[PDB]
């Protein structure tokens, strides 16, 4: 059955990136997920919240 | 052939005495003046823990007893 699966996989592809991924092949997961997104915002905001208000100080 | 019946009665008390579960909200209250002819098997941490004494009053107590009676 495993062999059959493998065969199927082979047919579907090879593959280029898939091979690389396999080669690379860890870690955990923690608990739950979504949505990460970007970062360096909060302080950036404050950096701007200053600047903003500093601009508003400039105002 | 009379003792046999009692002993068990003790063992009965004994068995269901500690057989509970720690959760069984059931307290045991035993009253006796001659706190002496009591198999120690009774007064063991678990079956009979708190041991309480009832003095023959004195001065103060009597005042409460007297005042309460009168």
């Amino acid at each position: 059955e495993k062999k059959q699966p493998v065969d199927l996989g082979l047919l579907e592809e090879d593959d280029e990136f898939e091979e690389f991924p396999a080669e690379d092949w860890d870690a955990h997961v923690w608990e739950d997920n979504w949505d990460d997104d970007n970062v360096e915002d909060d302080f950036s905001n404050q950096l701007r919240a200053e600047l903003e208000k500093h601009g508003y100080k400039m105002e | 052939g009379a003792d046999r019946e009692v002993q068990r009665i003790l063992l009965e008390l004994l068995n269901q005495m500690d057989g509970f579960d720690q959760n069984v909200n059931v307290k045991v209250i035993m009253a006796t003046n001659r706190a002496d002819t009591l198999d120690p098997a009774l007064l063991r941490p678990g079956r009979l823990d708190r041991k309480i004494e009832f003095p023959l009053p004195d001065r103060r107590q009597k005042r409460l007893i007297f005042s309460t009676i009168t």
Binding site: - | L14, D18, A41, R44
Partner: protein, 58 residues
């Protein structure tokens, strides 16, 4: 077997008497790690009991 008064089957356990006596005594089941200030003794005890048993060949 009730009326046949032959063994129908052999039930499990018997209950032991010595165990029953021990239960009736109820003497705290105490593990070491709970008595500080009683080593020298313990050592002695070990010497007079533990060692004597562990390796009576000693």
């Amino acid at each position: 077997r009730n009326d046949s008064y032959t063994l129908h089957k052999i039930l499990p356990n018997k209950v032991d008497p010595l165990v029953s006596l021990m239960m009736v005594e109820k003497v705290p089941d105490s593990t070491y790690e709970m008595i500080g200030g009683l080593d020298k003794q313990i050592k002695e005890i070990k010497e007079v009991i533990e060692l004597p048993v562990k390796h009576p060949e000693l």
